[PDB]
Amino acid sequence: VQPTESIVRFPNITNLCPFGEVFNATRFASVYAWNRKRISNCVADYSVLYNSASFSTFKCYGVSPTKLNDLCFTNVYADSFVIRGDEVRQIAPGQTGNIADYNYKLPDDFTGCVIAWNSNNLDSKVGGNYNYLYRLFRKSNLKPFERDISTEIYQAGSTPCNGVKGFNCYFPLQSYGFQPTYGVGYQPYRVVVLSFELLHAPATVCGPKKSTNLVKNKCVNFNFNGLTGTGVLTESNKKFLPF
Amino acid sequence: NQNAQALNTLVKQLSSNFGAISSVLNDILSRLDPPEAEVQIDRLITGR
Amino acid sequence: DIQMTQSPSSLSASVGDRVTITCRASQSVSNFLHWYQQKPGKAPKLLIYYASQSISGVPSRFSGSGSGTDFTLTISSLQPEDFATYYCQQSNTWPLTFGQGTKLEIK
Amino acid sequence: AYTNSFTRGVYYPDKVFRSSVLHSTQDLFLPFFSNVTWFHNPVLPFNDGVYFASTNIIRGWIFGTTLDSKTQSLLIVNNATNVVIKVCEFQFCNDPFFRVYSSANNCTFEYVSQPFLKNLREFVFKNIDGYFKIYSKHTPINLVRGLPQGFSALEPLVDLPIGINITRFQTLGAAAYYVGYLQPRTFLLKYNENGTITDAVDCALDPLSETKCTLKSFTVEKGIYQTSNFR
Amino acid sequence: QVQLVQSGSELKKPGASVKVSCKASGYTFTDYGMNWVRQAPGQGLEWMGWINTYSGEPTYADDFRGRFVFSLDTSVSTAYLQICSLKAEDTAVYYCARGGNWDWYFDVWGQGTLVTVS
Amino acid sequence: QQFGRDIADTTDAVRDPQTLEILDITPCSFGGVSVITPGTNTSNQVAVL
Ligand SMILES: *[C@@H]1O[C@H](CO)[C@@H](O[C@@H]2O[C@H](CO)[C@@H](O[C@@H]3O[C@H](CO)[C@@H](O)[C@H](O)[C@@H]3O)[C@H](O)[C@H]2NC(C)=O)[C@H](O)[C@H]1NC(C)=O
Ligand SMILES: *[C@@H]1O[C@H](CO)[C@@H](O)[C@H](O)[C@H]1NC(C)=O
Ligand SMILES: *[C@@H]1O[C@H](CO)[C@@H](O)[C@H](O)[C@H]1NC(C)=O
């Protein structure tokens, strides 16, 4: 029995998400102190995100960008940082290196987009912008989504300095020094990734699909906030608890 | 018991991943493009 | 895109009193406000940057404070020769959006 | 002081409804018949999750890492029949007993929920991938020397997506409370016809429970069965 | 002395195209950006855009995206705005601002070209 | 010889570096576990094989 009716049952919390707060922001912070913003309980339009041509290293892994509007996700964890112009290959699952291992690590089962633009007018001063920062020397390989905000002095060879910088003692947090005379491998990249999760929580945040009023016991093709299937909707006596 | 248990095993192997990102067909169809999603379907095809 | 309203629009004040005026933003601007004046026929002059700190070289008859979206500044000693329309300036999200202005009037 | 939990510390694994089936899962659970710590209050480690039991003497809870306003720290107070949850940078007292809720600064999250409550209040707190989950029931009891026998699976009430490093907790001629610890062991759960979890077993506790968990039923017959491999 | 000298009062037809000036001296012109603002007489400050002082790309605000062009000339410290195809709603005074890439607090200082349109 | 090789790509004996003294590789003790039970209706007493 083919479905003779397709119904849409997205929730109607019609207030929009603050992607303008996330994307159009003055101060994206550094890769050692990348900012997390929780996006929930709103309608999120990703068509203006994909249709904007300012991005050049988009590369959404696991979810295709055109078919992204019609599912509904549990949570958006908007991470945002500024890196060098050759380290977006480090911002990917599987790849290891300086930015990937010692600054920000993605999960191996990562599902999300790697949205970034190239900003040379904004984040480069003639002379060098010196508080955009990155960590080289660290005695711990980071598990994904970790915070290394500590400014402890690193000891390498034998004797611990423990509070001073000197022989075999390097400070971990060193500046980029972004100048506009640099090439495209040294230009600032403002990388803002959107980590999602499919099945861990209630599905909340998604696109502007217009909901359709429900119909009864004829076999229909339903869309209940991201799960698509064909079947018969019938009244039930199953005591669903509110979680 | 053996026939119903083999039927229950055949039902319960539908929820297996076999290396996929998800085991249900409609979710891996609905958020992926077809020319990248064909091998993603095909792993579940050969496992089932 | 930050729809900033500020209240009250036209308020009266007297000599040597203490008055409190507020500037409100719709979205989160959590610690970024800059405060201006507008005398007629004069370019604006900055007082308070990042909503707490004051600029060097201003007469300190005032202070600024606040957190979240509820921001204010308080005149601790008012003088009649100011009568300036106070302007608030956000610096968190583009575009840089200003306020309408609270015009100070003497009786 | 040490005592034993009987069948407590069970909850709902995946926030999902099941009926008249037996489901096997792998999740952080309190083991059956393990040594749980009884107190009649110093700061205690949270580790991988805590089972809490209590029997208006009992008040709210604090959660944190160092409690010295360097890391975000949870604070729950049930005041004026209106619970307020804050995550701000408080400084804890040396002997906390409004000084506990002092200096609410650098706040990132605040939440207001519905109020709750010879009685037992068993709570489960768990932190998995930055998600702080609170499980709650109220159940009358008639045993003060120890933990009463019986089964009651804990339903989640408010889920917190906070995402901090959690290490420690504390509880604000008195009452008594129980502390249990959670371990990653496999459980088999019996969902009843009306949606409640009537019974469960812990698969790694007993070879009999290994047969119950491998055979996927709570009743095995006489005979021989193979469950796992000893290496 | 740090000041921003601004051109005189323009008065033209609704449809002409003029070019006001903002000439700066005293500070490092390369270090800071070159913000701009308008004054409707019954309203307040309204921003249009920043200009990087090494290349000069004309990025604007989200409202005034159209016919408005900023043209910076390097090494002479001139920061010309060119307004083209003026309308009757552009009866505003256009101050000039020093607004950097990092700081974004103004200390705005301009004499103000009295652009009256009729 | 530096190593001895058993059937189907498993290594049986290796001579050691810095000493050249011959060693045998035997795998560690393994086996399945088994449960003798009279049934949960009768008793919970368990013999383990
Ligand atoms: C972040 O900022 C960008 C930059 O403005 C926003 O993009 C959109 O950009 C276009 C042109 O670049 C603008 O659209 C405008 O639409 C109105 C009505 O259709 C039209 O009359 C104008 O002439 C102009 O074309 C506008 O700046 C903006 N569109 C909006 C805000 O709807 C972008 O939307 C911002 N937000 C995010 C989440 O990226
Ligand atoms: C059946 O559901 C009712 C709900 O009113 C509940 O009170 C009862 O305990 C349930 N039965 C069992 C055996 O759990
Ligand atoms: C358990 O065993 C006794 C005697 O062996 C028998 O009478 C009883 O019916 C059994 N229980 C069940 C549930 O079959």
mmCIF file with all atom_site columns, N, CA, C and O in Angstrom, chain D residues 229-231, chain F residues 26-33:
data_model
loop_
_atom_site.group_PDB
_atom_site.id
_atom_site.type_symbol
_atom_site.label_atom_id
_atom_site.label_alt_id
_atom_site.label_comp_id
_atom_site.label_asym_id
_atom_site.label_entity_id
_atom_site.label_seq_id
_atom_site.pdbx_PDB_ins_code
_atom_site.Cartn_x
_atom_site.Cartn_y
_atom_site.Cartn_z
_atom_site.occupancy
_atom_site.B_iso_or_equiv
_atom_site.pdbx_formal_charge
_atom_site.auth_seq_id
_atom_site.auth_comp_id
_atom_site.auth_asym_id
_atom_site.auth_atom_id
_atom_site.pdbx_PDB_model_num
ATOM 1  N N  . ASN D 1 229 ? 34.375 -16.378 27.875 1.00 0.00 ? 229 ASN D N  1
ATOM 2  C CA . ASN D 1 229 ? 35.643 -17.086 27.764 1.00 0.00 ? 229 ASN D CA 1
ATOM 3  C C  . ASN D 1 229 ? 36.613 -16.541 28.800 1.00 0.00 ? 229 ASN D C  1
ATOM 4  O O  . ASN D 1 229 ? 36.748 -15.322 28.945 1.00 0.00 ? 229 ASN D O  1
ATOM 5  N N  . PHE D 1 230 ? 37.285 -17.441 29.512 1.00 0.00 ? 230 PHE D N  1
ATOM 6  C CA . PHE D 1 230 ? 38.277 -17.056 30.505 1.00 0.00 ? 230 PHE D CA 1
ATOM 7  C C  . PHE D 1 230 ? 39.658 -17.003 29.867 1.00 0.00 ? 230 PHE D C  1
ATOM 8  O O  . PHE D 1 230 ? 40.164 -18.020 29.385 1.00 0.00 ? 230 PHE D O  1
ATOM 9  N N  . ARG D 1 231 ? 40.262 -15.816 29.870 1.00 0.00 ? 231 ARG D N  1
ATOM 10 C CA . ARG D 1 231 ? 41.634 -15.628 29.415 1.00 0.00 ? 231 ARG D CA 1
ATOM 11 C C  . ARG D 1 231 ? 42.412 -14.902 30.498 1.00 0.00 ? 231 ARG D C  1
ATOM 12 O O  . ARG D 1 231 ? 41.871 -14.011 31.158 1.00 0.00 ? 231 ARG D O  1
ATOM 13 N N  . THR F 2 26  ? 54.719 -19.923 23.884 1.00 0.00 ? 26  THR F N  1
ATOM 14 C CA . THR F 2 26  ? 53.498 -20.683 24.077 1.00 0.00 ? 26  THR F CA 1
ATOM 15 C C  . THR F 2 26  ? 52.412 -19.682 24.428 1.00 0.00 ? 26  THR F C  1
ATOM 16 O O  . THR F 2 26  ? 52.697 -18.755 25.201 1.00 0.00 ? 26  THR F O  1
ATOM 17 N N  . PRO F 2 27  ? 51.206 -19.760 23.858 1.00 0.00 ? 27  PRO F N  1
ATOM 18 C CA . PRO F 2 27  ? 50.152 -18.806 24.231 1.00 0.00 ? 27  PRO F CA 1
ATOM 19 C C  . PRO F 2 27  ? 49.658 -19.029 25.654 1.00 0.00 ? 27  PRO F C  1
ATOM 20 O O  . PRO F 2 27  ? 49.769 -20.127 26.205 1.00 0.00 ? 27  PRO F O  1
ATOM 21 N N  . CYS F 2 28  ? 49.133 -17.961 26.253 1.00 0.00 ? 28  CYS F N  1
ATOM 22 C CA . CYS F 2 28  ? 48.656 -18.016 27.628 1.00 0.00 ? 28  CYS F CA 1
ATOM 23 C C  . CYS F 2 28  ? 47.365 -18.817 27.718 1.00 0.00 ? 28  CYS F C  1
ATOM 24 O O  . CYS F 2 28  ? 46.695 -19.061 26.709 1.00 0.00 ? 28  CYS F O  1
ATOM 25 N N  . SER F 2 29  ? 47.029 -19.238 28.939 1.00 0.00 ? 29  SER F N  1
ATOM 26 C CA . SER F 2 29  ? 45.961 -20.206 29.149 1.00 0.00 ? 29  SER F CA 1
ATOM 27 C C  . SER F 2 29  ? 44.593 -19.577 28.924 1.00 0.00 ? 29  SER F C  1
ATOM 28 O O  . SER F 2 29  ? 44.240 -18.567 29.539 1.00 0.00 ? 29  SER F O  1
ATOM 29 N N  . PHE F 2 30  ? 43.825 -20.190 28.028 1.00 0.00 ? 30  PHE F N  1
ATOM 30 C CA . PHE F 2 30  ? 42.521 -19.672 27.651 1.00 0.00 ? 30  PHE F CA 1
ATOM 31 C C  . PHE F 2 30  ? 41.524 -20.818 27.656 1.00 0.00 ? 30  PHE F C  1
ATOM 32 O O  . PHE F 2 30  ? 41.888 -21.987 27.799 1.00 0.00 ? 30  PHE F O  1
ATOM 33 N N  . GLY F 2 31  ? 40.261 -20.463 27.486 1.00 0.00 ? 31  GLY F N  1
ATOM 34 C CA . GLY F 2 31  ? 39.210 -21.453 27.398 1.00 0.00 ? 31  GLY F CA 1
ATOM 35 C C  . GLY F 2 31  ? 37.878 -20.817 27.702 1.00 0.00 ? 31  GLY F C  1
ATOM 36 O O  . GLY F 2 31  ? 37.788 -19.776 28.360 1.00 0.00 ? 31  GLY F O  1
ATOM 37 N N  . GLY F 2 32  ? 36.831 -21.460 27.196 1.00 0.00 ? 32  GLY F N  1
ATOM 38 C CA . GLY F 2 32  ? 35.488 -21.008 27.489 1.00 0.00 ? 32  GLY F CA 1
ATOM 39 C C  . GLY F 2 32  ? 35.088 -21.336 28.914 1.00 0.00 ? 32  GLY F C  1
ATOM 40 O O  . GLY F 2 32  ? 35.618 -22.251 29.543 1.00 0.00 ? 32  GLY F O  1
ATOM 41 N N  . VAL F 2 33  ? 34.145 -20.561 29.437 1.00 0.00 ? 33  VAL F N  1
ATOM 42 C CA . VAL F 2 33  ? 33.574 -20.807 30.753 1.00 0.00 ? 33  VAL F CA 1
ATOM 43 C C  . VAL F 2 33  ? 32.181 -21.387 30.531 1.00 0.00 ? 33  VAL F C  1
ATOM 44 O O  . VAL F 2 33  ? 31.566 -21.159 29.482 1.00 0.00 ? 33  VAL F O  1
#
